[PDB]
């Protein structure tokens, strides 16, 4: 523990200085990258009957709402889906359960209409 040995400490410090810098790299933003790629955000519903709202497009271009607890599973949609389609999706969720499938079919459907 002599000042002449300060060289030694400069080693450890330079390592610490390094190690710290390495652990604090910005690498916890997976969700935002996903959203940017897929252009799909998951938001609250405009009416809490339907809690979950899926949104396709950078603007509020397409979106659909789901109330998986009430007796109206498939809620609102701005692209004005027809009854048959809404029943189709309500069964892709009620019977199938494949949520991914529901999202692909809902996207294809909504992007067709205006």
């Amino acid at each position: 523990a002599s000042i002449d040995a300060f060289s030694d400490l400069e080693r450890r410090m330079d390592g610490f200085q390094k190690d710290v810098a390495q652990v604090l790299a910005r690498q916890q933003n997976h969700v935002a990258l996903y959203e940017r790629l897929l252009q799909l955000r998951v938001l609250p519903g405009a009416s809490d009957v339907h809690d979950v709202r899926f949104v396709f497009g950078d603007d509020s271009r397409c979106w659909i709402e789901v109330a998986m607890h009430g007796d109206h599973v498939i809620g609102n949609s701005h692209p004005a889906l027809d009854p048959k389609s809404r029943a189709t999706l309500e069964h892709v969720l009620t019977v199938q359960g494949d949520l991914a499938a529901f999202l692909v079919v809902a996207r294809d459907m909504l992007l067709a209409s205006l």
Binding site: H30, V31, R36, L37, L38, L99, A100, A101, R107, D108
Partner: protein, 97 residues
């Protein structure tokens, strides 16, 4: 005489007292708390995005599509290459075959 510390002992002491340990420790605690927040509040959405079949490799700087059964897949890079609309369109087209 100048270029000669007027009182070096007092200088070293003054450096030791200004070396705030608990401050940076508390900062580290704040950082781990933030990380746990990001984890908890990302869990579900990440489970959904991975449920689609898309998975990420920020190591290889590329993303992977594994909705193609029978040992096939797709890859897409994130260098400063092309526009985002291109990427999105490709990822979505190759997903719901």
């Amino acid at each position: 005489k100048d270029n000669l510390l007027d009182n070096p002992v007092e200088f070293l002491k003054e450096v030791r007292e200004s070396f705030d340990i608990q401050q940076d420790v508390d900062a580290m605690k704040r950082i781990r708390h933030d990380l746990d927040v990001i984890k908890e509040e990302s869990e579900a959405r990440l489970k959904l995005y991975r449920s689609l079949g898309v998975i990420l490799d920020l190591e290889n700087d590329q993303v992977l599509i594994n909705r193609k059964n029978d040992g096939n897949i797709d890859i897409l890079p994130l260098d400063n290459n092309l526009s985002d609309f291109y990427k999105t369109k490709y990822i979505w087209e190759r997903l719901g075959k």
